[PDB]
Design a binder for these strands. Sequence first.
RNA 1: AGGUUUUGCGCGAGUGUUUGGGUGUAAAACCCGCACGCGUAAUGAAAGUGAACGUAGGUGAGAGCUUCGGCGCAUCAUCGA
RNA 2: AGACUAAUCGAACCAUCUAGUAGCUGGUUACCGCCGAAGUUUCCCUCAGGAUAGCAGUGUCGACCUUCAGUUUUAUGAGGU
RNA 3: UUAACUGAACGUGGGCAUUCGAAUGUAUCGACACUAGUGGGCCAUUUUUGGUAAGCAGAACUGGCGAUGCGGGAUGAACCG
RNA 4: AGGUGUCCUAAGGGGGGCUCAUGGAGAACAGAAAUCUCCAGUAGAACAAAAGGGUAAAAGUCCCCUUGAUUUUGAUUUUCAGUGUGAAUACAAACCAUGAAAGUGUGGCCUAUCGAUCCUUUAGUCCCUCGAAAUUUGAGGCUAGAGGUGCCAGAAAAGUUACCACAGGGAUAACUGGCUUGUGGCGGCCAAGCGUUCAUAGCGACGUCGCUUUUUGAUCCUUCGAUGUCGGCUCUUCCUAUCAUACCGAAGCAGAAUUCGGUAAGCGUUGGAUUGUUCACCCACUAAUAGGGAACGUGAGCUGGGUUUAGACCGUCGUGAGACAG
Lengths: 63, 158, 104, 53, 149, 183
Amino acid sequence: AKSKNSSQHNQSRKAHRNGIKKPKTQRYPSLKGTDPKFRRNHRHALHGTAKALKEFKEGKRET
Amino acid sequence: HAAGLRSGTRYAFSRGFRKHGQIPLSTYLRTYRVGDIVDIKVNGAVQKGMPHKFYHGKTGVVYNVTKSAVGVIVYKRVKHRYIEKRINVRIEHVKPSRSREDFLRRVKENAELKKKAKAEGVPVQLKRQPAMPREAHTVSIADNKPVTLAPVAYETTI
Amino acid sequence: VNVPKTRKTFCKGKDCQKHTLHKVTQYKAGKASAFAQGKRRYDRKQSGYGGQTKPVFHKKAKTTKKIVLRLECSVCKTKKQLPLKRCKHFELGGDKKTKGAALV
Amino acid sequence: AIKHNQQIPNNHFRKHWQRRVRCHFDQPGKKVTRRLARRAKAAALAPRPVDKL
Amino acid sequence: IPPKPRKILQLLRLRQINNGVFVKVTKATAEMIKIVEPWVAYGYPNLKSVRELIYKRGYGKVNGQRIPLTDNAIIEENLGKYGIICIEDLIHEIFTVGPNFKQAANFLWPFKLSNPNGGFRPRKFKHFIEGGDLGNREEHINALIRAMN
Amino acid sequence: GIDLRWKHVRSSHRKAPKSDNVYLKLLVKLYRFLARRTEAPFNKVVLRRLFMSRINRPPVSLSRIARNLKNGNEKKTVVVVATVTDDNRLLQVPKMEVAALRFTAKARARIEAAGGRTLTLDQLALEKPTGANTLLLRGPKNAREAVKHFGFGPHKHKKPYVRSKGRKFERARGRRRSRGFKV
RNA sequence: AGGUUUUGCGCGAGUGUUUGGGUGUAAAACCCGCACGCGUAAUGAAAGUGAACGUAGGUGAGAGCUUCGGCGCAUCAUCGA
RNA sequence: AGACUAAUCGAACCAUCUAGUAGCUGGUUACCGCCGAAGUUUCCCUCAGGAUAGCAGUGUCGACCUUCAGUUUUAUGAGGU
RNA sequence: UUAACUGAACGUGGGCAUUCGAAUGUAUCGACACUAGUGGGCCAUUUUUGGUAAGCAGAACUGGCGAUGCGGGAUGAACCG
RNA sequence: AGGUGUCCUAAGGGGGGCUCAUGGAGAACAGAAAUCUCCAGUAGAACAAAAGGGUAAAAGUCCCCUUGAUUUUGAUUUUCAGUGUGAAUACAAACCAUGAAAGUGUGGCCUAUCGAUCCUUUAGUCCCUCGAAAUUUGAGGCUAGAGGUGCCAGAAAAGUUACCACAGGGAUAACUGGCUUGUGGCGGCCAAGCGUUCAUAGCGACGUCGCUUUUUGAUCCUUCGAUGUCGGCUCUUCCUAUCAUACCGAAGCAGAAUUCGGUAAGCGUUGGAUUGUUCACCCACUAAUAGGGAACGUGAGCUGGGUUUAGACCGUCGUGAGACAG
Ligand SMILES: [Zn+2]
């Protein structure tokens, strides 16, 4: 026949049992969602600067 | 029993009393950069790019900037774990937050106190500390003499 | 609900790739040929003794259908399809509704 | 009734398989019989080889 | 016991009946105690009371072990870099709150006392002001430490 | 009562090998002695790795050691508490001096043909009892076929348990968007 | 019988003798090899195509080693090929 | 009269298929030691039942990383009882 | 992107610790693998819905019985210690 | 307390001029209300629809032009397992509308208005395959829509059993017992009034406070591997809310006959016609013919008239098997 419908009696205790784990923050957050126009430019910018560092060895005064 | 996108938002999304009509234009002149600390507060008069009722009052970190909107990161609490949500909100609903402003003010004085003290030759005592109990002192009764009190009798007022 | 007999919109043709004028028509279902794999497989399963071998639908609930417009390009004769919402009465090419002249 | 992440099973044990089970418990015994037959065949074909080109 | 006062007691290092610790009163701790008011009794110690508490029941925390303080060498090997080398330095730093009070008081294990001698009162789960035994008694906790320990 | 959250909580790391190799037990006795009576952390780290299991001691290869033999390391001692195998791609083997748990037949042959030395862990303790001028190496821990199935789910890009690979197996619905949805 | 994770063992870019043959103190023990199974290369419905610009890359951490300047295994995050 | 057809009839008796199926009752065999729950979320011709998440045990690995916290203080936001 | 080396992101180099920038605790840090039982609940202070009311039916935060003995309420699963 | 299975070529998009509902005062027929004019007028009007939010040189209203209700795939939000469906948000690459321009536009101002696998059918490239080799028909493939499941995460489906069967349930009804007392029964408090005059000899409106478990309800805690389920016959005992008997107090108590109250349960409380009756109504005697309990006392104490197995008849209902607290 009829029975109970809903409850939230033991949920808070069950959750706090072994902690509410907040995810760990990092140093370089991902670029998933940033605007594609900015993304295109950023890729080129890193490519160019990376070559300059290697060039700064055979060449000079790239600071 | 229903659950719509704006259920139970009768008093939250409303504008105030004697605050109707034109939106002050100084809102549209602020600028945002990634890493800024903003807080969400929705305006009822603008129906485009508005957030769900849960984020009305939360605080988050900008992670993206676009033509007329910013991307904010905030932390939601599902049962027994946290999740990070990424929402898109129009700048008409956002505002720069004064949560870290005290920290920035304090760090500047700390640097300059330390610099000045190193040149002079006295220790610093820079980090703050809670309110300690009071200290001893003396109170005079000259030209201030005590007045005697006493409880008052009962009487009906009506 | 009425729609004009012609309208101009995008044309995905290999040489148009731009807005062009289109003729509007309604979509009618195919004749349902008797050589499709489904029909051939069904006819073999139903032969011999055994009776009816696949379900037959009985519980209808919908009163309407969705209408889908067929478009035809005026230049390259490419075609497009666009669905609408549900509607009871539909007709294309009607006379534009007048304004402020109502009288009975 | 799946309960966890497993590989979807397909075991063709649904007829009366127990009535047709073959076990090879006579693997050495047969080998001995075959060798006896070869020697008898070799003795019958006295100076000739056993196989054929 | 409800979850909030439970956590506060765990942080105050009072996980057992008849445990005692020293704390320095500031605005950030005087009010914290007020939350657990229906579970503790506290007051102001004097010189005699702290003196006997350290001698008779003093134990120390060394590598996470309860080591009884029977020789001055134990204190120097663990609190020597702060300038504490003898029982008087420990007692002095605890009594007159000094710049190293924090380390001094975290060294000592929480004291385990026995039930008092002359009982408590008729009903001991009310407040001292009304006539009970728990809460803030000002200077009358010295008489309670004498009997309890 | 005492009102604690944890009590009688065991440890989490092995404290002795679960194998019963007689020669392995001798290593453990020797390095127990060394780690107890020295101050070089090299000895303690070697001791712990002697307990591990075969999936915690993945194999290393001549190419991986050859990688770390550059930029001023051509005269250090490589130590690998694991097996050491050959690589069919490294065409020319440099000059090395290796100390490993066990080599393969071809791996040992090729090292000694270039003009190096292969040791064992007992000889290593006899030559460099403090680990001076050594460098420790590990193998790739996540390079097992059984690790690509961990944490399977939607939007995870992991490997499923299927009895065969081809067109008819777990392609129709939920992968391509042309039949229902996608993951 | 067929799967899956974990523990011990042998060999290791290979691994697995026993369907079968040779032999035997005979249902034991010992030896032999052509094929074959799994792995070494993926992706598409398919015809098909098919993995190095760099000392096999850059950045932030990392046990250990170190001539004290630095080199940085496993693994985590991120931008690239 | 649903009556009678070997004390058996609103479908006789005998052997086999047959150890026929059951989301339903009943039972389930020596000792000690350590840890120790749920009756709740979503879906099902689902409501005496299953899958899914949660609560629990065991096996470990990375450091002994020095980080964390069912708490307080200080600064600053949101709410319509 | 801006009229523009004007900006935006990522960078090289340098400077600021003498004290790394509130309290308390750290009798318990992070990640992974495989799996058992459970999915009929009931009681109490405070808030509270239907009902004249009920040892009635239905909810929120917390604490208990179920899964737990001991001293008190003469007796009694939920009360006090 | 209510609402949805719709409606719209404009009721979508852009631009531009204007301000509303209503009140005051005037103008031939004209009046309460037709059309015109001035002043005031914070939204009290309008925005397709239920309710809430929002809007004043507009998001309303009138005028001009159009089809962003278009093409290619991705990211994010609410319900959530952070799966699917519905709906929504911010960009990217194209082609366009409008405006002098900045700009705005990816359907309806925001919160609802809808749909999987298999099969059929249409659109697209000029694409792959029919496995001995070619060419044209035919068929099978890849990408996007439509045909529908309202029990809406989606089986193809009429009744009866009073001839009945099996596995279970006190998780679930019909009887006792337990908590409650609305309804049922009984008793009080104040006093407008009746009683010839006079509130309380005898009564009591409008209101209000209680008691009991011999009526009936509400709940489903205990029993479904069973507690024998209406009434009558015989027999014992208990309660008092007293019909008669003992002794008394009041009266609108002259006598007689009566009415109200107290102490009191020791002692009695009937014979018959009709009905299975419990309940009821008549005849007659008597001092009187009071009300109740005990597992609605009482079936190894009786009887079997009724209900409540199987046979059978009638009336109404059903096409029929059959149904009826007739
Ligand atoms: Zn065209």
